[PDB]
Design a protein around this ligand. Structure first.
Ligand SMILES: CC(C)CN(CC(O)(O)[C@H](Cc1ccccc1)NC(=O)O[C@H]1CO[C@H]2OCC[C@H]21)S(=O)(=O)c1ccc(N)cc1
Lengths: 99, 99
């Protein structure tokens, strides 16, 4: 699909058995998901943006379905105000920015 | 152009007669630029990002050239870690997300 940007580019994602809404975000290096339980081992990490830094749990090799498309990668879990799909997973689904 | 996302999508912008680098950011509603002097009156705005809220100055009807494309619109100025081009100006240059 070709997504115009008059509105936030929100899509449905499936992660750890749950269905969620998330933002397709070319400005995000990594994917960040709101507080949830995911299986496996994790490591703590700090992620910085506007307003400062937040502490997140880094999970590796997680499978996510993005708009019907299977992708695997690192997922950061923490107190984010919005679920964000960042470049680590956008590349896997072949997303491009075009103008 | 068609831009892939293996690397940050950085472009050159020209604002206030200066050349600067900025991130094309579909996850940003607004365009936010680091501290610099712009003409005219400004208005106050609060911007909420991943780590908290920041106060910025809002300037309207600012001419900015984005990777060679001329856009005219609202720019926010404040302590952002990186210049960000958000959807308000991405739509002016006709950018879309495709996959
Ligand atoms: C600051 C830039 C370099 C990075 N951000 C991504 C984002 O797309 O720039 C962010 C994604 C985001 C969206 C909404 C809430 C929180 C984060 N939006 C954002 O800060 O936008 C600001 C300006 O415009 C307003 O609209 C959105 C919120 C304001 S970030 O969320 O801090 C971020 C940083 C690191 C990683 N791995 C993932 C995300």
């Amino acid at each position: 699909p070709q997504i115009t940007l008059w509105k936030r580019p929100l899509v449905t994602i499936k992660i750890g058995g749950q269905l969620k809404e998330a933002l397709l975000d070319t400005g995000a290096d990594d994917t960040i998901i709101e507080e949830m339980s995911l299986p496996g081992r994790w490591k703590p990490k700090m992620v910085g943006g506007i307003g400062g830094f937040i502490k997140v749990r880094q999970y590796d090799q997680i499978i996510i379905e993005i708009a019907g498309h299977k992708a695997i990668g690192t997922v950061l879990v923490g107190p984010t105000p919005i679920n964000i799909i960042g470049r680590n997973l956008l590349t896997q689904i072949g997303a491009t920015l075009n103008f």
